[PDB]
Design a protein around this ligand. Structure first.
Ligand SMILES: CCCCCCCC/C=C/CCCCCCCC(=O)OC[C@H](COP(=O)(O)OCCN)OC(=O)CCCCCCC/C=C/CCCCCCCC
Ligand SMILES: CCCCCCCC/C=C\CCCCCCCC(=O)OC[C@H](COP(=O)(O)OCCN)OC(=O)CCCCCCC/C=C/CCCCCCCC
Ligand SMILES: CCCCCCCC/C=C\CCCCCCCC(=O)OC[C@H](COP(=O)(O)OCCN)OC(=O)CCCCCCC/C=C/CCCCCCCC
Lengths: 319, 309, 316, 316, 300, 318
């Protein structure tokens, strides 16, 4: 909704990457429920628990029913197929759900959500307020608009007193970033390590000779190359997500987001009384700067006592 | 406003319930699959091996499959997702059980309306400045409104006891779910020894079967068990926070420590409970609403209004 | 929509119950369409049109796959009970009829017009700025004109709806139909739920095409179609109980006579008369939902409030 | 939408019936796509190009699965009745024709423009506070809107009485619906009995299979019979609604509406007896809610305009 | 949409015909994707690469199930006519091109801007209170109307695009009817395939049954009927755009009925869309006449 | 919503082509997921690992189980069928998603999305301003004059804010360049590999120990369908190429970072309207491509002569 201003380009990038990754997870999952199997053919000659591989050609007669073949397929699919090939889409879905929860935890946690909705509401309604344009242009003002202006000044002052005390939003954003980057590291490590176990040809030895007659079978996993390219695409997407995450971490740690200097806005306008806002307020103002500096520029006019003095004088003239 | 009265544990339990509902729906769609269990008869009639001919048609194999699915597979391995759906529906219904009560809803709406209109009151900031005109008349009216709230809410204690009842229901339901799921999670096995007596139909009596989605159902059951365990830990912390401090008694002495006026009393019952709700949400709301409780503060406001008039 | 006010707790409860019944109907219909069949195997030993049941090796029936399919189709058509075959369609039809009974109140044009007009004036009175001042007991020209027009529209609407009761009659008929259909549904479903059996002995006399007379069949979805049916029955019971309570709510008190003694005694406007018929019925429905709407509307029909409103309009 | 005001109980009943028949058409078409196969078994002993119908061991036909599929396809194409194969498509086509005939009223641009203008003027007369103030027997914006609205009503009344295109269109729509109902009932009642579970096919594919006559089972035949009975019941209800609508049009001249009761009730006793298309849309208004015509009729009498201009002269 | 009035009865009727054509195209497409196949059986006996057909016992073919599937696929690819295989895709493409031709008059930004300007000024004249006063007997609105007239009488791009769209929609109808009528007889239930897979199957000639042919027959016939309707509508549309000149509009009837007789004869794109207005409902044009006459402007 | 003014005819055409390409991508993907298979029959007589192709006729007894046939199909589909015939719809889906991302990165990047939204709001406010009519005419209420002055000041502030730097023009140029090079690569490799989608495939996978036959002949039933889904797709890309190429020419035939109001300042009396530049110039050129009237009636808010006229008119009303 109105939280788009609080989502910089990295957050939008991770939001879209997570959406595409969830699409990958859904596609792999429905293929795994639908058409995941292992066509297994027994090895007629065996040598030390291994296939021997030793006038027209004629087909090999295995004397197996269709249902014995299905039993062999199910047994070898359960036992000798690697766990990564079986549970890749569900692992991807779990990872993407945790990524989305980490990216949207501060929106749902009440202690940070209250501050965030307050900031978004008063900042947007300050942005569309007319007295902001009136003051930045430097008459007669409507009664309703004057009441809105004085109420917005008082609300901005009370919110500034309410928010600057703590740094809960900054700490939560920080922790979300480290959690996302360490999970990216773990995901890339284990996925790259286990991605080579998705193979087309799987040799299974499941000891079902009492039910079938053969012990070793040579199975073909049809969705092995498709799962391999899906896993490679997932690894590439996680790599992009992680690079964006380390960029966000470097942006957070390079400067001090707990300290805002309004020297750009205050020197540009005649108002040299705008204070250097600190803490959580400075953090979300830095986020808004990552979205658009105009919102911060038009909001800074509500933090100066000169502007409220002029507003009070004009309102006393109107009253 | 019904979001504000919801602490972090309630939102966490709601999201866990949503995830559990998703798990149940996925399990049901897993149960949609036609091919469920695959059975083969036992004791059937460079070393070269040869296949064992069971002398069975495809229809005989299908009959054996359905007989062993009905009479050999455990009921848990067949009806786990439906139980998950039922349990998550009951969990979701009881999540807002203290929300949906008529009197509870009325007092919650009155509290949030009074607190929100107090939050945009200029005289709250005026009294905060004093501690550290027309709006005076509005503050006097809001003081009579706070007194009306005290007469309308504090006489009862429905909200705290009903919330305790809902939390206890959640805790006991988590206990029952964990208990029977731990008791029956071992029944979801891959290889099943089916011993139906269809010897007069297929010729065999003992069969060895495999449940094709036994591994996936076991993983789903373990994921549901982990979700229910997290839900139970959250509800146990909720019970600990509910019972370790008496929510029938809110001491405003923490406001008294930094704010000089000592006239504000220690609220009891439903008022104290909902103030503890708002303290868990944002303690600034309570520390600001404290100044509207005193009577000598009302007398000072009356003096200011008399000076203005 | 706008008619959320007119739906009491029993109505929304039956709405959720009907949604759940429709969900299980869709699930059962999907299962019936996709994988409802029976696996029929011939009985080699026959005795009085029944199966004798007198290492191990399999029994060779000498039947093709298509002979098996024909046997399955014929014994599904002839020997499996109609309830097991058509339970999802029956629950779908019953849920559709219950939803039609619920929404025929909203769709019948005369009662739809009455309910829509009532809801519109009640929502504009609930959000009327004059109500806050009246409960707190000068006027803006636009606000005063709106208040005067609203008072006259409430008066003429009361005269318009007090003539006849068609909303209450439709609600009575809908509750009666919903409880009668509940009784019939419970009776026939309870009687026929025992016919859903997993094992069915079929005897269809296709010996000329197959070679066997009696076959034993497994109906794979029977047990599921058992428990769902039981679940369905449970839901119906809840539905019926709710409807029964609503029927009692129609009969314990006269729903066509409403007294404002809960408001006219408390408020200074003790001149409020007792409204009747359809107006009384919708006001009782509001009291079931929220008495605040009726309390805030009650000032717009007394004539003392009209006198004081005209005095305030004159003072401007 | 905005045309909900013009649709009486018969129109909304037919709309809900039509959407139900669309639901059964979609279901029948989906099942005809998915499981409309038939299982054909050859008759081992042929007697006079028929079937003689003359421990146990299964009959061996020496036919592959693909020969069985070929026999199934050939006998499904040739010896299954066309009704049993194209019942859902015919039902869909009939329901689409019903929908088109019911909604061509709202899509023909001349009649759609007339109906939209009528709805707009009726709704803005509903929103007008001066309409209620005059009936109860001055704000500047209220006066401007009022004068614009009476001039609007005079312009519309001069416009619409020229031709009764909308009434004739409604007549043609009802006639088309009733004759199509008659034809549907006739051919469906004739041909519903041809949907049989057990059929005998004789397709002369002995060159490819080896058998001449086959006995086939159509598994969807009984479900299609149930769907056809449901469709026949729905079309019977729709046709009865069409009979009532046609009787409503033929009972009284809908091109002649008298405001005699309305102008007798009100102080204004000079509301003219309107005719033609305006009378027709006003009769539909009375079918939906008489209050709309009751409050709109004050804009047609000359005495109301005389007092409006007198009050404007007092205001100006 | 916003142009609810610029679309006359032929436009909306063809739009609904296009919608029904599109849904039958989608139904046929899913039909061809899901279960479309053909069951192929060889002739065992042979007489000059045929079958002779010299109680009854079934004919053994010694063919595996996969050999049958191979014969099915090969005969479906080689000896089934391409119309019976790609009829729904052709219908879907034709309806997509029809909808593109219908909505290119809406989507092109220059024509879209012109149409939205005319629609906005027409609607704000329709809801204006001063037109009622004028008909009984806004200055900035009148100046806007004059400026729009000067802007829109410069060119007739909208009428030219409508004319071009009509020509494409009638010649495409002609081509569709010709090719579909010529090739609708190639959808047969029983076909003969001679694909020369004797080295893989052992048989040369096969008789195949196409299960969805007859449906694909009648749908095609159904499609043809719909196309005919479309063409007939388009045919009269051509007449409507050739009997009278739409680039010049005469306000003679309205200016004779109204008190003001100074309404000029409108030309160009303004004339074309006012002709569309008169086709929909003459009230809008009659009402916009009094917002154009300079005498009424002097009275305003 | 209100972004339709910033989409010229080429952008709308490319959006519709991307939608159609996505439709055929999901169609081919559904086919490839659900009925993509390969019917492989062994060649009974072979010569040097090649198919030799050599009393009613009787079927060839291959003596192969159904599951041996399934294994042969799976192996020769994995090993011998070309990767293009197997992953063409996924490639089309990936290319369509990349094209859509390139098209909508203009609106999704916050730095340019904020400027685009500000320009849309300012332009629509100037479009609906009544004073513009008077500004195009050559009385106003107090509210009308006050809002006209406020929106005049807003236009001046926006011009100061956006004209300082070009981020919208740079991103649009980069998106067009990326789309052009993507079209070039797509056309090249698709045209090169479209000839490998063949119905008949001779497969030789060496599974003689599991089946008994060395070489097999395989029919790929969807291949022909994929052919009519491939060449068609190529044609779409060609259109999506040429249109994009035209867009590139539109960004290079003239400097879009210099908007000239010469036509307006000559037609209208206000000759003091400056020659705006940079991102303001680029979005004004885009709006000119959409509808010249928006720019025409927006040009009266960039001149101080109109500001003096509005001030004098407001004083006359006062
Ligand atoms: C982790 C979350 C995952 C969410 C899962 C969603 C619900 C999953 C349950 C599915 C519900 C019912 C569908 C079951 C159909 C099963 C039929 C089946 O298995 O039959 C076996 C048989 C094997 O197929 P072959 O032809 O060998 O295919 C091999 C591919 N070369 O399959 C069939 O006969 C038909 C298969 C039915 C397919 C149904 C699913 C298709 C899904 C469509 C995919 C959408 C693609 C999107 C775009 C693709 C990229 C451009
Ligand atoms: C009120 C009535 C409404 C009726 C609407 C019904 C909608 C569906 C109608 C279309 C039917 C399509 C028939 C498809 C048959 C295809 C071939 C076949 O028999 O499929 C069997 C094949 C066996 O599974 P495999 O994946 O092979 O398993 C082993 C490998 N893992 O697949 C199936 O089980 C069925 C195939 C798809 C049919 C079902 C499609 C829609 C299913 C909806 C799921 C509903 C779940 C609801 C979730 C919540 C429940 C509380
Ligand atoms: C341009 C269109 C683009 C969209 C196309 C999307 C493709 C469909 C997506 C779903 C994939 C599932 C398809 C699975 C096919 C393979 C399964 C299989 O082997 O099926 C075998 C079997 C073949 O024989 P039967 O149909 O019994 O033949 C009887 C002769 N009358 O087929 C089936 O059982 C059906 C398979 C699943 C079908 C489900 C999809 C069908 C969709 C129906 C379309 C119409 C719906 C609404 C009807 C409108 C009213 C007329």
């Amino acid at each position: 909704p109105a939280y788009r201003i609080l989502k910089p380009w990295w957050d939008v990038f991770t939001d879209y990457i997570s959406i595409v990754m969830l699409m990958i997870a859904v596609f792999g999952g429905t293929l795994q429920v639908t058409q995941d199997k292992m066509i297994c053919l027994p090895c007629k000659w065996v040598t030390k628990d291994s296939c021997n591989d030793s006038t027209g050609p004629t087909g090999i007669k295995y004397d197996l029913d269709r249902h014995q073949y299905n039993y062999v397929d199910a047994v070898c699919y359960e036992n000798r197929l690697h766990w990564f090939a079986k549970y890749f889409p569900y692992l991807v879905l779990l990872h993407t759900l945790i990524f989305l929860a980490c990216s949207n935890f501060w929106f749902k946690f009440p202690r940070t959500s209250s501050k965030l909705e307050h900031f978004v509401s008063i900042l947007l309604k300050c942005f569309d307020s007319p007295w902001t344009t009136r003051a930045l242009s430097e008459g007669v003002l409507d009664k309703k608009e004057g009441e809105q202006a004085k109420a917005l000044f008082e609300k901005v002052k009370k919110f500034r007193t309410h928010v600057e005390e703590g740094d809960i939003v900054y700490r939560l954003y920080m922790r979300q970033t480290i959690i996302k980057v360490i999970k990216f590291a773990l995901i890339i490590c284990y996925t790259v390590y286990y991605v080579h176990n998705i193979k087309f040809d799987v040799d299974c030895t499941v000891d079902i000779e009492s039910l079938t007659g053969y012990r070793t079978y040579r199975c073909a996993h049809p969705l092995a190359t498709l799962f391999k390219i899906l896993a490679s695409f997932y690894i590439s997407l996680v790599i992009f997500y992680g690079l964006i995450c380390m960029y966000t971490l470097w942006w957070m740690l390079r400067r001090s987001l707990k300290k805002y200097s309004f020297e750009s806005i205050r020197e540009e306008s005649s108002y040299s009384d705008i204070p250097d806002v600190k803490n959580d307020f400075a953090f979300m103002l830095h986020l808004i700067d990552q979205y658009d500096p105009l919102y911060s520029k038009r909001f800074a006019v509500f933090l100066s006592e000169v502007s409220e003095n002029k507003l009070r004088q004009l309102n006393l003239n109107n009253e | 406003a019904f979001r504000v009265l919801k602490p972090w544990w309630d939102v966490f339990t709601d999201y866990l319930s949503v995830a559990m509902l998703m798990i149940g729906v996925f399990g049901c769609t897993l149960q949609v699959m036609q091919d469920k269990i695959i059975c083969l008869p036992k004791r059937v009639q460079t070393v070269e091996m040869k296949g064992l001919k069971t002398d069975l048609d495809l229809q005989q194999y299908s009959f054996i499959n359905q007989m062993c699915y009905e009479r050999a597979l455990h009921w848990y391995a067949k009806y786990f997702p439906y139980l998950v759906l039922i349990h998550t529906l009951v969990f979701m219904l009881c999540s807002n059980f203290w929300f949906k009560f008529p009197g509870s809803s009325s007092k919650i709406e009155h509290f949030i309306s009074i607190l929100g209109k107090c939050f945009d009151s200029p005289w709250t900031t005026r009294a905060l400045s004093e501690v550290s005109k027309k709006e005076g008349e509005q503050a006097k009216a809001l003081f009579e409104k706070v007194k009306k709230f005290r007469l309308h809410v504090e006489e009862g204690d429905i909200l705290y006891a009903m919330y305790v009842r809902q939390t206890v229901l959640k805790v006991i339901k988590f206990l029952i779910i964990i208990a029977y799921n731990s008791a029956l999670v071992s029944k979801v096995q891959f290889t099943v020894d089916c011993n139906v007596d269809i010897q007069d139909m297929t010729g065999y009596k003992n069969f060895s079967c495999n449940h094709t989605m036994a591994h996936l159902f076991s993983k789903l059951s373990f994921c549901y068990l982990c979700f229910v365990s997290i839900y139970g830990l959250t509800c146990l912390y909720t019970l600990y926070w509910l019972f370790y401090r008496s929510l029938r008694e809110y001491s405003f002495e923490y406001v008294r420590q930094e704010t000089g006026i000592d006239d504000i009393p220690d609220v009891k019952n439903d008022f104290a409970f909902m103030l503890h709700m708002i303290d868990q949400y944002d303690p600034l709301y309570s520390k600001r609403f404290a100044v509207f409780l005193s009577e000598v503060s009302e007398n000072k406001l009356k003096q200011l209004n008399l000076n203005n008039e």
